[PDB]
């Protein structure tokens, strides 16, 4: 079983016990980002002029 206390800043589970954990945001920028193929869907006659 695990418990989290925002007020006391503690995380206890079994024999472990963590206090004062500070986390800073990563840039979130990752390369090789997906490039979706965007398209439209329009009725097209056969004989165009």
């Amino acid at each position: 079983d695990v418990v989290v206390s925002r007020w006391l800043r503690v995380t206890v589970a079994g024999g472990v016990h963590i206090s004062g954990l500070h986390t800073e945001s990563a840039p979130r920028r990752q390369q090789e980002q997906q490039v979706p193929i965007l398209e439209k869907f329009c009725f097209t006659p056969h004989t165009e002029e």
Binding site: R6, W7, L8, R9
Partner: protein, 48 residues
């Protein structure tokens, strides 16, 4: 000493006391204050 302080200062309550021989008072203060903390601190204490 808790009894003496209670006798001298009636306005204090059972929740306004902690332990000075250990670091347990941090949890007490944080719990009873809602996690915000305290404004002024007067600290004649050691490293830990």
């Amino acid at each position: 000493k808790r009894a003496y302080l209670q006798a001298r200062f009636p306005q204090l309550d059972s929740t306004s006391f902690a332990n000075s021989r250990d670091t347990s008072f941090e949890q007490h203060v944080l719990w009873h204050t809602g996690g915000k903390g305290v404004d002024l601190v007067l600290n004649s204490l050691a490293e830990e």
